[PDB]
Design a protein around this ligand. Sequence first.
Ligand SMILES: *[C@H](C)[C@H]1/C(=C/c2[nH]c(/C=C3N=C(/C=C4\NC(=O)C(CC)=C4C)C(C)=C\3CCC(=O)O)c(CCC(=O)O)c2C)NC(=O)[C@@H]1C
Ligand SMILES: *[C@H](C)[C@H]1/C(=C/c2[nH]c(/C=C3N=C(/C=C4\NC(=O)C(CC)=C4C)C(C)=C\3CCC(=O)O)c(CCC(=O)O)c2C)NC(=O)[C@@H]1C
Ligand SMILES: *[C@H](C)[C@H]1/C(=C/c2[nH]c(/C=C3N=C(/C=C4\NC(=O)C(CC)=C4C)C(C)=C\3CCC(=O)O)c(CCC(=O)O)c2C)NC(=O)[C@@H]1C
Ligand SMILES: *[C@H](C)[C@H]1/C(=C/c2[nH]c(/C=C3N=C(/C=C4\NC(=O)C(CC)=C4C)C(C)=C\3CCC(=O)O)c(CCC(=O)O)c2C)NC(=O)[C@@H]1C
Ligand SMILES: *[C@H](C)[C@H]1/C(=C/c2[nH]c(/C=C3N=C(/C=C4\NC(=O)C(CC)=C4C)C(C)=C\3CCC(=O)O)c(CCC(=O)O)c2C)NC(=O)[C@@H]1C
Ligand SMILES: *[C@H](C)[C@H]1/C(=C/c2[nH]c(/C=C3N=C(/C=C4\NC(=O)C(CC)=C4C)C(C)=C\3CCC(=O)O)c(CCC(=O)O)c2C)NC(=O)[C@@H]1C
Ligand SMILES: *[C@H](C)[C@H]1/C(=C/c2[nH]c(/C=C3N=C(/C=C4\NC(=O)C(CC)=C4C)C(C)=C\3CCC(=O)O)c(CCC(=O)O)c2C)NC(=O)[C@@H]1C
Ligand SMILES: *[C@H](C)[C@H]1/C(=C/c2[nH]c(/C=C3N=C(/C=C4\NC(=O)C(CC)=C4C)C(C)=C\3CCC(=O)O)c(CCC(=O)O)c2C)NC(=O)[C@@H]1C
Ligand SMILES: *[C@H](C)[C@H]1/C(=C/c2[nH]c(/C=C3N=C(/C=C4\NC(=O)C(CC)=C4C)C(C)=C\3CCC(=O)O)c(CCC(=O)O)c2C)NC(=O)[C@@H]1C
Ligand SMILES: *[C@H](C)[C@H]1/C(=C/c2[nH]c(/C=C3N=C(/C=C4\NC(=O)C(CC)=C4C)C(C)=C\3CCC(=O)O)c(CCC(=O)O)c2C)NC(=O)[C@@H]1C
Ligand SMILES: *[C@H](C)[C@H]1/C(=C/c2[nH]c(/C=C3N=C(/C=C4\NC(=O)C(CC)=C4C)C(C)=C\3CCC(=O)O)c(CCC(=O)O)c2C)NC(=O)[C@@H]1C
Lengths: 162, 162, 162, 172, 172, 172, 172, 216
Amino acid sequence: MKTVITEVIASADSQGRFLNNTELQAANGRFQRATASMEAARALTSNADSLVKGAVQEVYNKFPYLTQPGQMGYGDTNQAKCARDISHYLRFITYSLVAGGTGPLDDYIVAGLREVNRTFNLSPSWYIEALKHIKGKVGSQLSGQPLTEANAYIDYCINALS
Amino acid sequence: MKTVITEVIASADSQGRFLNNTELQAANGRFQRATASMEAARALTSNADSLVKGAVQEVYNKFPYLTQPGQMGYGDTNQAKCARDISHYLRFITYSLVAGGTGPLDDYIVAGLREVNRTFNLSPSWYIEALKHIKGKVGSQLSGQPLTEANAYIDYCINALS
Amino acid sequence: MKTVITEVIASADSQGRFLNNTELQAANGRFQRATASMEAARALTSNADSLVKGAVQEVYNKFPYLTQPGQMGYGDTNQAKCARDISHYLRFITYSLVAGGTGPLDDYIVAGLREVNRTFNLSPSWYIEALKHIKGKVGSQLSGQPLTEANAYIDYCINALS
Amino acid sequence: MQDAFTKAIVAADLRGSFLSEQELNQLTNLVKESNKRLDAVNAITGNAAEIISDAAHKLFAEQTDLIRPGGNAYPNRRMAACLRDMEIILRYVSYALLAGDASVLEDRCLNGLKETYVALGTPTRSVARAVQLMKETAIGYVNSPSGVTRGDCSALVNEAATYFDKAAASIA
Amino acid sequence: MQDAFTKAIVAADLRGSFLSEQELNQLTNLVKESNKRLDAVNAITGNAAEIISDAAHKLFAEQTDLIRPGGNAYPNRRMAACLRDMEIILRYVSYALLAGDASVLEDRCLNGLKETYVALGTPTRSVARAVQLMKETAIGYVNSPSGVTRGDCSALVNEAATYFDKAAASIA
Amino acid sequence: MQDAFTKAIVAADLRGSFLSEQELNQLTNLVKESNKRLDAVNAITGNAAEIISDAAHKLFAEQTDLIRPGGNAYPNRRMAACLRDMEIILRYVSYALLAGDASVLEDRCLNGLKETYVALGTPTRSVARAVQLMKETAIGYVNSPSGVTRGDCSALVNEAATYFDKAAASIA
Amino acid sequence: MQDAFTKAIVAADLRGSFLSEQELNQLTNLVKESNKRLDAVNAITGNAAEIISDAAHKLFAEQTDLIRPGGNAYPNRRMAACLRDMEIILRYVSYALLAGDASVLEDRCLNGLKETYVALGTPTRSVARAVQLMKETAIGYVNSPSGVTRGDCSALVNEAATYFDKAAASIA
Amino acid sequence: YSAFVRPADQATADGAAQTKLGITAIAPDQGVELRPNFTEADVITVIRAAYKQLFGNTYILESERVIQAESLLRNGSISVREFIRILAKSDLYKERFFRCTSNNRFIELNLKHLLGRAPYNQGEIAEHLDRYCQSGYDAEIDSYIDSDEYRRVFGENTVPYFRGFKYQVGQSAAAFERMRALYSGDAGSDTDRNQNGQRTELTSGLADPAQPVRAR
Ligand SMILES: *[C@H](C)[C@H]1/C(=C/c2[nH]c(/C=C3N=C(/C=C4\NC(=O)C(CC)=C4C)C(C)=C\3CCC(=O)O)c(CCC(=O)O)c2C)NC(=O)[C@@H]1C
Ligand SMILES: *[C@H](C)[C@H]1/C(=C/c2[nH]c(/C=C3N=C(/C=C4\NC(=O)C(CC)=C4C)C(C)=C\3CCC(=O)O)c(CCC(=O)O)c2C)NC(=O)[C@@H]1C
Ligand SMILES: *[C@H](C)[C@H]1/C(=C/c2[nH]c(/C=C3N=C(/C=C4\NC(=O)C(CC)=C4C)C(C)=C\3CCC(=O)O)c(CCC(=O)O)c2C)NC(=O)[C@@H]1C
Ligand SMILES: *[C@H](C)[C@H]1/C(=C/c2[nH]c(/C=C3N=C(/C=C4\NC(=O)C(CC)=C4C)C(C)=C\3CCC(=O)O)c(CCC(=O)O)c2C)NC(=O)[C@@H]1C
Ligand SMILES: *[C@H](C)[C@H]1/C(=C/c2[nH]c(/C=C3N=C(/C=C4\NC(=O)C(CC)=C4C)C(C)=C\3CCC(=O)O)c(CCC(=O)O)c2C)NC(=O)[C@@H]1C
Ligand SMILES: *[C@H](C)[C@H]1/C(=C/c2[nH]c(/C=C3N=C(/C=C4\NC(=O)C(CC)=C4C)C(C)=C\3CCC(=O)O)c(CCC(=O)O)c2C)NC(=O)[C@@H]1C
Ligand SMILES: *[C@H](C)[C@H]1/C(=C/c2[nH]c(/C=C3N=C(/C=C4\NC(=O)C(CC)=C4C)C(C)=C\3CCC(=O)O)c(CCC(=O)O)c2C)NC(=O)[C@@H]1C
Ligand SMILES: *[C@H](C)[C@H]1/C(=C/c2[nH]c(/C=C3N=C(/C=C4\NC(=O)C(CC)=C4C)C(C)=C\3CCC(=O)O)c(CCC(=O)O)c2C)NC(=O)[C@@H]1C
Ligand SMILES: *[C@H](C)[C@H]1/C(=C/c2[nH]c(/C=C3N=C(/C=C4\NC(=O)C(CC)=C4C)C(C)=C\3CCC(=O)O)c(CCC(=O)O)c2C)NC(=O)[C@@H]1C
Ligand SMILES: *[C@H](C)[C@H]1/C(=C/c2[nH]c(/C=C3N=C(/C=C4\NC(=O)C(CC)=C4C)C(C)=C\3CCC(=O)O)c(CCC(=O)O)c2C)NC(=O)[C@@H]1C
Ligand SMILES: *[C@H](C)[C@H]1/C(=C/c2[nH]c(/C=C3N=C(/C=C4\NC(=O)C(CC)=C4C)C(C)=C\3CCC(=O)O)c(CCC(=O)O)c2C)NC(=O)[C@@H]1C
């Protein structure tokens, strides 16, 4: 899993050299930032649910036809899934903030994203909206660096999805 | 480009060995088949246009919302493109029938399909319908082996798209 | 073992892809030919013996000195061996006709041919004659494609021996 | 590698004999069925994507946990693998079907597969299940095609089954 | 690589069009000749060893120096190469003949061959000669077979020639 | 790989839940100690060469035989290895110390180390000994630096120890 | 690797001592025999091809089955191997003979050989037999050369034997 | 000034440790590098070596050997790493040493034949397994010689070597243990043709939890 700390170790390890000043400097960076990161996570964790509802919802407004019978958005099972899924995305995001690296995201969400989505005919687009809507809400509860961090990660997914 | 004939040569070449009986047997298979293949191509080539119209159309019935303003199916440019694209698919298919191999398909259509589609947000689904609708029409003009061949290739794309 | 069927599988396998139309065409070839191939085998199998006698014999006419004492052609043991060997060649040929590939020949006869022959001082020439004489006889019992097939394989050895 | 023809040869070789006439008649008949044989294969390849897609849906409807956190199909990464695997197995099976012999399947695919799954912690049972799910769907197509000359494919159908089953068994 | 069919396709592609009916009729007829085409190839492959053996003998009877100390075919090591080379060229030619296109031959064999030979100090002239020697012998077989249905192969014979000649030319 | 943070995540994942507030407070406090953590590492890395040099001297004063003809540290070539080894182990330990987790150490460094030693005929016991010798010296520095703000490092010191010990144990 | 000289050294090393005067006199004498030693080797190498050829003939006259379908020396492929193997063993033996030490032979040649043979299904007994067959023929030459100064080679002859035998034993 | 030296107890010496493992000089490796001006012999020795290292140490017939790849070495125009690419892209290796063994098997054996190391972790083995269907086989083998460490050591103009069985950097555990499994005796060689077919020496079971145990 890719976090700041793991990477420097990795790089140090590959070369076969002790952790010198260079790397520690880097680590320090991660730790200083954490305070902001951590704050953001506490904020998302708390409002989770509400964000999720809002997102799921949004998607349907954006793509009305989904709710019609014979479609994917139709019938509760699917709605449940849709909810679940977004929860996940969120969950991971929090994780990543705390871990101080994309790692968590990469391994759970991103890797194999495409094929999953292809085989089940999930349109990336949808997820994206979810995220965007979220981003917009988050853009109220947070501010300054905490916010900035939140964004970075949220986006990172947008980019991976698209 | 992968056709029967090219491959056996290739394989022969790699080993550094003369074309022996083994390969010729294979070749014989191809060219025997060709008679049917060729027929199919003549049939598609002739009805091209009509197939295209019908397909494009279908897609819109299947996905009404596409024709609404602010969507992809909307505004002539897009419609033109949509037409063009399907023409292509068809074109290649013919090619492949004649060449006696998937080769043509692989190199033009398939390779890099995903990323193109991703970056321009073309939903595979659409194309698929086009194809299916086509397949259905072709299932009248043709019969027996000629038909069978037509299908094989058409499908091959369905599978590549999905 | 190299037969038409095995190869296409192999090629398909390497690329990591399902058997598509390309390969099947090839396979079909093998199957249609088989009818002729099979016929040829039945003909050789039946006349085996007689072919063998005739061949062995021939060799001696061609190379009189072999039958002189202190030579290789001399003394029954050697003659027996000589017979045995040719039987083998024949046996395999039949096999290959049926298998629809050189495979059987390659693995039994051809691979390691040289060194064997070198270490025991068997002159390729001899075998060759055997074959040629055979080919000539076969050129009566068979006709059309059946014949053609028989030849191919017989030759294939000539070429491998030389 | 190996297949029906080559096989019979090999056997004959060790006896040291020319092929028995009886034995030829196995192969002679096998040839006759070719056309049928081929179409069977064609049907699988044609529907491939679907076969899988389908089987998966059913697999996951049954064993909900696989897709739940802590299960083996979770998260995405794993899921992907699981799909890939199914496919592979299929691919091979097809191969065999053409060859007219299990070997290829056994050697490339099935050999060691169980143990792998074990080491990973993948539940062999579930894998086997999936294989069957696939089997049924696949047969579905093999046996109900369109535009093909109507006749009896049973013989081939059963052989197909067997292949699937060898798979199921050795995995399980 | 390329061959007659693929080629025509490619052309058509750049125009952006389906194949012209005229163009189909090139391929349609090409198919018809297949059987002839094939036998031609078969004849070469069948006689391969000989073709070479023969050509060599004649090559060395003519250019005695090649085999004398200081020549290019001396000593054994070199000789071997020279034989091998001839063969290769032949092999390719055959390939082409099947494909119905020079390309394969040009691309994987001939291109830059000249320059190689130059750098080595191999006399390109002599190489070319050998190619022809081969040509004549080869045609000999292609054109005089036994047990094949009698007809006219000229069309193929000439195309064969051309291939040999492209070889001769680009080497020379 | 893994480390303190990642680890806690993973646990949370399998439960399928957002992080407990309690759990955050583990990490929150862990952060606070960072500065201390870092200096600890820095101290080791800074003195590395010495730590080893020292440990060795003491190792060889104790187990005279190792350096005697026929022993395991004799001759030069072997000696070298033995030194190299010690270093490595140290290197890893450090890594762990930064991560705040044994894992890295266990996986790359320790796992199967014992068996290696066995196969070679190297006496595992002595290796273990060396590890400890190192431990003590290392702590020595961690705990007595110059120019650092004075406070309590015990927490870190002990964790350091543990790492050394896991090493000692699994080797032994 | 190792040989007579190196060996004695190594022994001396573990005792921790300079070479015994007695021990030198082993090596001193060993030197004197060199010339004899060499010729022995030369004789083998000179006759190599034949030694094998010969042994083989006899091997196959005895154990007819090896060359019959189902046997281990059938078909060609296998035969070839079997010949190659014999050679190798010989090659090594020679090496040893020069070195004045079994080691080289044991390590590169014999090590793992039995297990290989087992895995293949090769009948170890027959292999051993072949080795001996070789032995006798080889000695034949070693002991009866032409144009060499007449003297006693027994000492060397026996050592040769032993090497062959270590081979036979470890294979068997 | 005692200069007590003494035989000591264990008396293992330099040689004994390796003879115990049975490496018999497989662990020590002397690299072979080609030169733009080289004797044909020097090319031959390279070919000889190349064959062994990438092949099972299995017997290679003159027929088996591919002359076209051997041609071109004398000429130049083929990098030796590219020469080694031609091998394995060879039908010879795929049909034999690839077909029989399981996907896992050839990955380990490639990782052995092309590089000394046995596989440090389960995941990296898995990375190539992702490729099997992800892309064509040729790519995956190409990926090995294209991998960095293949380049880093014996990158160009050098026959690969079994640098395994010595200390290599970043060896995640059981380097020796796995390698001990993967290398039989020097004379002994992986066999295309073998009873019980061919199975992975290394337990699929492990590659994470425990060190492998294999017959030697
Ligand atoms: C919401 C925008 C839409 C929606 C989604 C939906 N998803 C599925 C099926 C799956 N979706 C995922 C996604 C995840 N599962 C995971 O474990 C992870 C990583 C932690 C993610 C992101 C997966 C893997 C599947 C496939 C297997 C499964 O059953 O979950 C469906 C069902 C489609 C089907 O055919 O099974 C749906 C409907 N639902 C909606 O209504 C929106 C359009
Ligand atoms: C039809 C179902 C829908 C549709 C299609 C559509 N396509 C584009 C853009 C592109 N289409 C292609 C396709 C190809 N070009 C090729 O060269 C090949 C291989 C031979 C293919 C399959 C490409 C490359 C593009 C990219 C840009 C271009 O037009 O060339 C669009 C435009 C999307 C945009 O925003 O640029 C559309 C709309 N049109 C419809 O109305 C349907 C929904
Ligand atoms: C016939 C043209 C001449 C002849 C033959 C002869 N052969 C041998 C010895 C061998 N012949 C073979 C051939 C095969 N064995 C196989 O397994 C296969 C592949 C299926 C073949 C083709 C072999 C292997 C041997 C060597 C071992 C053996 O003892 O048989 C000999 C004897 C050589 C000797 O010196 O022992 C002879 C004489 N006999 C004639 O009179 C012709 C000149
Ligand atoms: C899907 C039906 C089920 C499932 C699959 C699954 N597999 C793995 C991992 C591997 N599976 C294999 C497969 C093969 N090894 C071979 O040699 C062959 C034949 C040539 C195959 C197809 C292997 C080697 C692996 C290990 C490498 C990898 O990770 O892909 C996993 C992942 C294991 C993990 O814990 O990460 C999974 C999930 N598991 C399920 O949930 C289904 C029941
Ligand atoms: C069996 C599962 C189902 C079925 C198959 C079936 N096919 C035929 C006959 C033919 N099918 C083909 C198809 C091919 N031959 C080839 O070489 C290729 C690849 C290039 C294909 C795709 C052909 C040519 C024939 C012969 C001509 C014809 O179509 O009639 C039969 C008839 C029996 C026979 O040919 O011996 C059958 C039964 N049809 C079913 O009813 C099953 C559901
Ligand atoms: C024989 C007709 C004449 C001749 C040939 C000759 N060639 C070489 C050396 C080479 N010949 C080739 C040819 C090829 N190698 C390939 O792989 C291909 C196609 C892919 C070709 C066409 C090559 C590459 C070599 C170079 C290295 C080698 O050893 O082959 C020689 C020997 C050169 C030397 O000095 O070692 C010779 C003699 N020269 C003659 O004398 C004949 C007239
Ligand atoms: C031309 C150089 C010489 C020649 C050729 C020739 N061949 C035919 C007809 C056939 N030849 C074949 C042979 C094959 N078909 C295959 O698929 C294979 C590989 C498996 C071979 C080797 C076949 C099957 C035919 C069809 C009829 C037959 O029984 O031969 C002709 C006749 C014209 C035609 O195309 O039918 C000719 C002329 N014979 C000559 O006279 C030339 C010297
Ligand atoms: C030193 C404290 C004691 C000792 C050790 C010793 N080790 C070797 C040789 C090797 N040691 C290793 C071990 C490692 N492999 C790994 O993966 C790691 C890190 C995870 C290590 C540390 C290896 C691979 C070797 C073998 C190859 C090599 O020598 O480089 C020796 C030398 C003995 C020999 O003949 O190999 C020794 C001496 N022995 C002592 O004297 C100390 C008590
Ligand atoms: C513990 C064994 C020893 C010790 C450590 C200690 N350090 C601090 C505080 C700091 N130490 C550093 C060092 C770094 N911070 C970084 O970002 C980097 C990487 C470039 C390093 C090397 C810093 C910056 C601080 C903050 C300012 C300061 O030096 O005090 C403390 C103070 C308490 C705390 O940090 O919470 C302590 C206790 N003190 C001991 O008792 C040992 C000597
Ligand atoms: C022993 C199996 C048979 C035998 C050997 C024998 N050799 C010599 C003497 C010499 N042999 C050599 C040969 C070599 N010395 C070298 O440096 C090389 C490699 C270049 C060789 C091959 C030499 C130089 C001598 C000295 C002169 C000579 O030839 O006599 C003897 C004589 C006794 C001695 O100790 O040298 C003997 C007996 N003679 C037999 O009859 C044995 C069956
Ligand atoms: C001949 C007297 C007997 C015989 C030989 C035989 N050997 C094999 C197969 C192998 N031989 C070896 C042995 C070695 N590896 C080495 O590197 C060396 C020298 C140091 C030896 C001697 C190996 C590894 C193989 C395997 C080759 C491979 O896998 O391709 C066979 C064939 C068995 C097989 O199936 O490969 C045979 C026949 N056995 C007899 O029948 C004779 C009595």
